[PDB]
Design a protein around this motif. Structure first.
Motif, PDB file in Angstrom:
ATOM      1  N   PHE A 123      -2.917   3.359   9.435  1.00 46.31           N
ATOM      2  CA  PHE A 123      -2.638   3.308   8.010  1.00 46.31           C
ATOM      3  C   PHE A 123      -2.715   4.682   7.367  1.00 46.31           C
ATOM      4  CE2 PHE A 123      -2.165  -0.705   5.755  1.00 46.31           C
ATOM      5  CZ  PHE A 123      -2.169  -1.575   6.812  1.00 46.31           C
ATOM      6  N   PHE A 164       8.684  -8.547   1.141  1.00 44.19           N
ATOM      7  CA  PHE A 164       7.625  -8.207   0.213  1.00 44.19           C
ATOM      8  C   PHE A 164       7.327  -6.714   0.247  1.00 44.19           C
ATOM      9  CE2 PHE A 164       7.069 -12.699   0.914  1.00 44.19           C
ATOM     10  CZ  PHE A 164       6.819 -13.163  -0.357  1.00 44.19           C
ATOM     11  N   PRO A 165       7.088  -6.101  -0.916  1.00 42.88           N
ATOM     12  CA  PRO A 165       7.136  -4.632  -0.986  1.00 42.88           C
ATOM     13  C   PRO A 165       5.957  -3.931  -0.341  1.00 42.88           C
ATOM     14  CG  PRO A 165       6.505  -5.537  -3.096  1.00 42.88           C
ATOM     15  CD  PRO A 165       6.853  -6.712  -2.233  1.00 42.88           C
ATOM     16  N   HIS A 166       4.735  -4.410  -0.556  1.00 49.66           N
ATOM     17  CA  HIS A 166       3.573  -3.653  -0.130  1.00 49.66           C
ATOM     18  C   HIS A 166       2.810  -4.255   1.034  1.00 49.66           C
ATOM     19  CE1 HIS A 166       3.658  -0.419  -3.004  1.00 49.66           C
ATOM     20  NE2 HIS A 166       3.736  -1.256  -4.022  1.00 49.66           N
ATOM     21  N   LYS A 191     -12.251  -3.301   5.812  1.00 48.75           N
ATOM     22  CA  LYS A 191     -12.528  -2.079   6.547  1.00 48.75           C
ATOM     23  C   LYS A 191     -12.466  -0.887   5.619  1.00 48.75           C
ATOM     24  CE  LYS A 191     -11.026  -3.565  11.136  1.00 48.75           C
ATOM     25  NZ  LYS A 191     -10.127  -3.320  12.301  1.00 48.75           N
ATOM     26  N   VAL A 226      -9.138  -1.647   3.023  1.00 49.32           N
ATOM     27  CA  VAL A 226      -8.048  -2.366   3.673  1.00 49.32           C
ATOM     28  C   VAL A 226      -8.424  -3.825   3.816  1.00 49.32           C
ATOM     29  CG1 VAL A 226      -6.731  -2.655   5.760  1.00 49.32           C
ATOM     30  CG2 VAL A 226      -7.096  -0.396   4.872  1.00 49.32           C
ATOM     31  N   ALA A 247      -2.133  -7.538   6.142  1.00 48.44           N
ATOM     32  CA  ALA A 247      -2.894  -6.322   5.908  1.00 48.44           C
ATOM     33  C   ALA A 247      -2.187  -5.527   4.829  1.00 48.44           C
ATOM     34  CB  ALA A 247      -3.018  -5.487   7.186  1.00 48.44           C
ATOM     35  N   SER A 248      -2.958  -4.896   3.957  1.00 50.20           N
ATOM     36  CA  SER A 248      -2.380  -4.093   2.891  1.00 50.20           C
ATOM     37  C   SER A 248      -3.494  -3.365   2.165  1.00 50.20           C
ATOM     38  CB  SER A 248      -1.554  -4.953   1.941  1.00 50.20           C
ATOM     39  OG  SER A 248      -2.387  -5.877   1.273  1.00 50.20           O
ATOM     40  N   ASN A 300       2.861  -9.003   9.753  1.00 48.79           N
ATOM     41  CA  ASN A 300       2.861  -8.928  11.203  1.00 48.79           C
ATOM     42  C   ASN A 300       3.008 -10.334  11.758  1.00 48.79           C
ATOM     43  OD1 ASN A 300       3.000  -7.088  13.249  1.00 48.79           O
ATOM     44  ND2 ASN A 300       0.786  -6.870  13.529  1.00 48.79           N
ATOM     45  N   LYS A 328      -0.872 -13.167  -3.466  1.00 45.25           N
ATOM     46  CA  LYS A 328       0.379 -13.851  -3.784  1.00 45.25           C
ATOM     47  C   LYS A 328       1.083 -14.265  -2.494  1.00 45.25           C
ATOM     48  CE  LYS A 328       0.919 -11.237  -8.051  1.00 45.25           C
ATOM     49  NZ  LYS A 328       1.665 -10.141  -8.729  1.00 45.25           N
ATOM     50  N   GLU A 352      10.023   4.208  -1.093  1.00 51.04           N
ATOM     51  CA  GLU A 352       9.189   3.170  -0.495  1.00 51.04           C
ATOM     52  C   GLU A 352       9.524   3.053   0.978  1.00 51.04           C
ATOM     53  OE1 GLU A 352       9.497  -0.382   0.502  1.00 51.04           O
ATOM     54  OE2 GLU A 352       7.313  -0.505   0.557  1.00 51.04           O
ATOM     55  N   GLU A 398       1.852  -5.629   4.588  1.00 51.22           N
ATOM     56  CA  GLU A 398       2.290  -5.166   5.898  1.00 51.22           C
ATOM     57  C   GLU A 398       2.305  -6.374   6.825  1.00 51.22           C
ATOM     58  OE1 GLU A 398       0.390  -4.493   8.884  1.00 51.22           O
ATOM     59  OE2 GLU A 398       1.890  -3.267   9.906  1.00 51.22           O
ATOM     60  N   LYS A 427      -4.236  -7.573  -5.185  1.00 50.76           N
ATOM     61  CA  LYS A 427      -3.570  -8.470  -6.129  1.00 50.76           C
ATOM     62  C   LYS A 427      -2.169  -8.843  -5.699  1.00 50.76           C
ATOM     63  CE  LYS A 427      -5.258  -6.087  -9.520  1.00 50.76           C
ATOM     64  NZ  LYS A 427      -5.649  -5.477 -10.815  1.00 50.76           N
ATOM     65  N   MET A 462     -10.635   4.418   1.529  1.00 51.80           N
ATOM     66  CA  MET A 462      -9.390   3.727   1.846  1.00 51.80           C
ATOM     67  C   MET A 462      -9.791   2.327   2.299  1.00 51.80           C
ATOM     68  SD  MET A 462      -6.641   4.373   4.925  1.00 51.80           S
ATOM     69  CE  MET A 462      -5.370   5.344   4.187  1.00 51.80           C
ATOM     70  N   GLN A 474       7.657  -1.120   9.794  1.00 50.58           N
ATOM     71  CA  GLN A 474       7.611  -2.232  10.748  1.00 50.58           C
ATOM     72  C   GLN A 474       8.858  -3.082  10.540  1.00 50.58           C
ATOM     73  OE1 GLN A 474       4.623  -1.912   8.821  1.00 50.58           O
ATOM     74  NE2 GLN A 474       3.498  -0.764  10.388  1.00 50.58           N
ATOM     75  N   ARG A 495       8.663   1.316   4.777  1.00 52.83           N
ATOM     76  CA  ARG A 495       8.094   0.189   5.519  1.00 52.83           C
ATOM     77  C   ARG A 495       8.352   0.414   7.003  1.00 52.83           C
ATOM     78  NH1 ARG A 495      11.309  -4.319   1.897  1.00 52.83           N
ATOM     79  NH2 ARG A 495      10.684  -3.501  -0.152  1.00 52.83           N
ATOM     80  N   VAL A 537      -6.578  -0.085  12.985  1.00 49.98           N
ATOM     81  CA  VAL A 537      -5.840  -0.297  11.750  1.00 49.98           C
ATOM     82  C   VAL A 537      -6.068   0.860  10.791  1.00 49.98           C
ATOM     83  CG1 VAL A 537      -5.671  -2.782  11.936  1.00 49.98           C
ATOM     84  CG2 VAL A 537      -7.732  -1.755  11.039  1.00 49.98           C
ATOM     85  N   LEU A 538      -7.303   1.343  10.665  1.00 50.87           N
ATOM     86  CA  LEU A 538      -7.528   2.498   9.804  1.00 50.87           C
ATOM     87  C   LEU A 538      -7.276   3.820  10.514  1.00 50.87           C
ATOM     88  CD1 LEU A 538     -10.415   1.374   7.468  1.00 50.87           C
ATOM     89  CD2 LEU A 538      -8.030   1.977   6.942  1.00 50.87           C
ATOM     90  N   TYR A 574      -0.989  -8.527 -17.361  1.00 47.51           N
ATOM     91  CA  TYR A 574      -2.412  -8.561 -17.647  1.00 47.51           C
ATOM     92  C   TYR A 574      -2.655  -8.208 -19.107  1.00 47.51           C
ATOM     93  CZ  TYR A 574      -4.148  -9.126 -12.914  1.00 47.51           C
ATOM     94  OH  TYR A 574      -4.457  -9.654 -11.684  1.00 47.51           O
TER      95      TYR A 574
END
Ligand code: ZN
Lengths: 58, 93, 81, 210
Positions: free
Chosen positions: D7, B85-87, B41, B66, B7-8, B91, B16, D34, B89, B12, B64, D38, D36, D3-4, D198
């Motif tokens: 977030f 990984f930076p962004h 969502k 998701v 999830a994020s 699980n 990856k 930054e 999420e 892009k 927003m 979790q 995180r 989830v929403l 890009y």
RNA sequence: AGGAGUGGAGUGUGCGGCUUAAUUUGACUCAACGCGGGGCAACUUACCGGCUCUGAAGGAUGCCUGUGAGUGCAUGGCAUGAGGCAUGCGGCGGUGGUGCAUGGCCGUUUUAAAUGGAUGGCGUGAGCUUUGUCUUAAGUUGCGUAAGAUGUGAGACCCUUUGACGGUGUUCUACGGAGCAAGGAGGGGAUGGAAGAGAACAGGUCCGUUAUGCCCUGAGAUGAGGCGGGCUGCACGCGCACUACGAUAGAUGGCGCUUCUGCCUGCUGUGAGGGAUGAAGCUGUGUAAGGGGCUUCUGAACGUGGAAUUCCUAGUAAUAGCGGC
């Protein structure tokens, strides 16, 4: 407007402590029954440590 | 029974992580190198642009979005290069 | 009001160990960790700003305090033996 | 939902903790943050330009950020973990240059000698372009704005989200607040570190028959 | 060229005026007026009438203070146990003033199509490199010319979704493009949005902000709470709406259901159309309500609206509705 003043007790600290022979400290003015032995209750059902809670009318 | 869930907010960089884990899990206990792709969502809000009551009154709605993918591969003790990984999420249940 | 002296030394203990503090600005309630009313903390940490011990950084209804070198060096001679 | 609904409470904490670090790391070249939420320890990464001065000797200055970030998140004392880093290219961050022009105006330099000291620090780092705006009571009691551009910018389109980099800053003089805005265009990079990986959508290149 | 209206009526609620202890205020062609996400019983709240608190950094000078400074006691003596009072430099608070001292963000010209370097040439110099013409939503393309090329803006791009391109035939063209057909899930910017260089305005906001310069205020405070009143007062002028003036209809039943705003139908042949204003009785929310709902009765003005005037080119206008804030 104006507010009310107060009166202080300088020598009344010596309530009934009676310095006698052999340093026989005479203690009167029985304290609150629901509190320590050192907190001498106010006269006629008033106490001091509790703001008004301890009220021993005797 | 392993179950990896993703999830994020940006996509892009979620593709990856769902392709870099394609090859480092290819030659392992599990197979079927694929990942389901659920429908996204959305959460919306609509408001006034004007910071007082002057002008023409103009509105704008924010979203927003998701994205989220799934993994189902039963294995036994086969990882921490997923937690780097930076962004996204990650699980792992 | 007069903050009771049993509460003042309580606060100067947390500043030594943790060297920080976080005060939600209101009048009602108690501090979460310290069980002292929010109104005592607000009155007392107006004197640790005049002396020059901490520095306040207020953000979003919360004021974050940070100890300083002159303050850390000063509290030693009152709580360190 | 579920989830929403998390977030948005997670992101509502990133907007406040990011608002505090850039006030307690003013004079150290703060770049980004930054979060995180979790992990076993809640990770927090800080990109700065003065690592051996934000930490402080013995990490006395780092063990304060860890206690204030644990009180806010409502966790135990040793359940949050701050990690400091260092920016890759000091000259391409638009928020570091926005404050370098601001420590000068508090230093008696005039706003022309200070702006040009921050336009050539973007040329040397090989940026495509760079615009700057200064607006306030610059030299009197009647206020005006002045722009300073030294390259190629791009304003409309979808690639603007990836190719531009913004930064604001204000100076509190004896007269009143002055504004500063900096926008930088990052160079195309096939590896994807300095700038994006890009090409812009309206660039057509024709191969060779060989 | 056409369709539905507004201006006339009765109600909903914004503005002016008058009134009041107070009826807190900002905005006045477009680009003020169901706008401040402004549907106010308390709070919101900036206003009015009494009452209570300090939620008063720290230095300096005089004075007082462990032989008790102060504080709680619904009643006056106990209990706790270190500061208080007077002047001033100063820190601090304010929905107190100035948007014509500022930042940030919005609106307007712009729903437009306009512009920046460097080469060549033209002028002693600033400076100019023009006035054409075809086509396009567009300085969008194409020709003609002392000019030839490259950026920003338009386009591409993104929400977004089957390589659809005026591609094929046909009728005109300045070779830029335009109309009409077929085939096709889709046809002429594929639809609707989002976006939108550089200048200007003394446009709006200090009542949004621990954004901010200067002035004003300081204990019987322009600070912080608690209780009642007001913002809803009503001769009159105006702006946006909701419901009507009937048979292409009203009343009552049936059919469709977790669907729908429709379909069939014994009565009414016309003020059984309309539903304002007020009475008596029952009830919900809440600390507080003749404000909000329901039952029987009362039943207005209104007969399609003067000069003026607004929106609109297709799954749209107009009709009837359901969600969310
Ligand atoms: Zn007692």
């Amino acid at each position: 407007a104006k507010i009310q003043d107060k009166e202080g007790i300088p020598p009344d600290q010596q309530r009934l402590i009676f310095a006698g022979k052999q340093l026989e400290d005479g203690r009167t003015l029985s304290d609150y029954n629901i509190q320590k032995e050192s907190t001498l209750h106010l006269v006629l059902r008033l106490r001091g440590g509790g703001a008004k809670k301890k009220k021993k009318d005797f | 029974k392993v179950c990896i869930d993703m999830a994020s907010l940006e996509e892009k960089q979620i593709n990856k992580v769902c392709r870099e884990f394609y090859e480092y899990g290819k030659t392992f206990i599990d197979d079927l190198q694929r990942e389901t792709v659920l429908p996204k969502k959305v959460e919306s809000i609509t408001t006034l642009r004007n910071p007082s009551g002057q002008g023409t009154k103009k509105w704008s709605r924010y979203k927003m979005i998701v994205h989220l993918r799934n993994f189902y591969l039963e294995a036994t003790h086969q990882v921490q290069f997923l937690r780097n990984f930076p962004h996204v999420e990650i699980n792992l249940s | 009001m007069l903050v009771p002296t049993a509460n003042k030394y309580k606060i100067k203990r947390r500043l030594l160990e943790k060297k920080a503090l976080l005060l939600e600005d209101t009048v009602l309630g108690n501090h979460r960790d310290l069980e002292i009313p929010n109104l005592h903390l607000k009155i007392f940490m107006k004197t640790m700003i005049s002396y020059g011990y901490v520095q306040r950084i207020h953000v979003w209804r919360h004021s974050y305090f940070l100890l300083t070198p002159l303050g850390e060096s000063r509290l030693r001679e009152e709580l360190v033996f | 939902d579920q989830v929403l609904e998390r977030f948005m409470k997670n992101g509502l904490m990133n907007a406040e903790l990011k608002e505090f670090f850039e006030k307690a790391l003013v004079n150290e070249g703060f770049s980004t943050m930054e979060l995180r939420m979790q992990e076993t320890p809640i990770k927090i990464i800080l990109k700065v330009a003065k690592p051996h001065e934000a930490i402080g000797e013995k990490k006395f200055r780092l063990r304060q950020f860890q206690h204030l970030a644990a009180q806010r998140l409502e966790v135990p004392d040793e359940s949050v973990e701050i990690v400091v880093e260092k920016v890759h290219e000091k000259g391409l961050c638009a928020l570091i240059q926005a404050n370098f022009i601001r420590e000068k105006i508090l230093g008696g330099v005039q706003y022309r000698r200070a702006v040009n000291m921050a336009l050539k620090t973007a040329r040397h780092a090989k940026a495509q372009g760079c615009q700057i705006i200064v607006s306030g009571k610059l030299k009197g009691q009647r206020a005006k704005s002045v722009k300073f551009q030294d390259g190629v910018l791009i304003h409309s389109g979808d690639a603007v989200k990836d190719y531009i980099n913004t930064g604001y800053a204000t100076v509190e003089t004896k007269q009143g607040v002055i504004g500063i805005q900096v926008r930088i265009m990052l160079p195309y990079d096939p590896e994807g570190v300095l700038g994006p990986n890009y090409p812009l959508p309206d660039r057509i290149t024709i191969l060779e028959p060989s």
